[PDB]
Amino acid sequence: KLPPGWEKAMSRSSGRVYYFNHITNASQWERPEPARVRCSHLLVKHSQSRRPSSWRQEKITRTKEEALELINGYIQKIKSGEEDFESLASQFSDCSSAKARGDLGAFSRGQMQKPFEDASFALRTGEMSGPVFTDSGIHIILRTE
Template sequence: MSGVSRWEPPVGTDVDKLKSYLATHHKTSKPSSDVPQIPKPKEQAGGASGVGESKIRAAHLLVKHRDSRRPSSRRQAQITRTKEDALEELRGHERRIRDENDPATLGSLAFEFSDCSSYSKSGDLGFFSRGMMQKEFEDAAFALAVGEMTGPVETASGVHLIQR
């Protein structure tokens, strides 16, 4: 098992009707109270990182681009943005998260904008160990101390912000 979430609609499904239903019945302007809320990241203070830990818990916000390994998401059937556009979008999210005057958190932005199915849990991936994620993602996540957030991390899936 790769740990990658993937769902394809059954053969014969009217994808436009499905998208319309999901947009009408499963989209809210803010996360519900049963969705984990992820606080703003701490400034990197040289705290204990995940190095040496067997499992860590992290959340992320993924922005896919047309060269991603699966260039589609709940928001867009065929993603056409360039990698540069995806990075620009992700950097905009990063600026908002790091802005003390902006109430946005990684969790709230992941819920609204992430191209990963973990959006429904505010980007929370739960606990994972080495070997379960793509190497670039794993290395960045395990290097963080609890509460820290990366800058953009590029993987075959797209570009991510990762927070422990």
């Protein structure tokens, strides 16, 4: 009955049923392929990233755990409406796509790191991922088309 990738869960703090996607790491309260997709992302690197450097910081020394805390904060702020995805990507994404509000443009299967690709294609149009881990760092992914 659930579509692929989705499972039922209950909140630990409230008991309320929600649904979680183990490909995109998205979670939502409601019960829930193209040749190409277009996405934007926000990348937070850490000391084990393949290249631990960006436009923001020449040497990135934060731990994978500190990177995840930052990603989770940004997700909260985006979900609350307190900040826009695009604004946070432009400020805080450790990737030159920050200068395009995080836009990567359109892409096919075969082109990106696999966890990124699978999350991207498993998102609905307009849906945002949870934290997505790759050799580059931890991503928030927004599917725009």
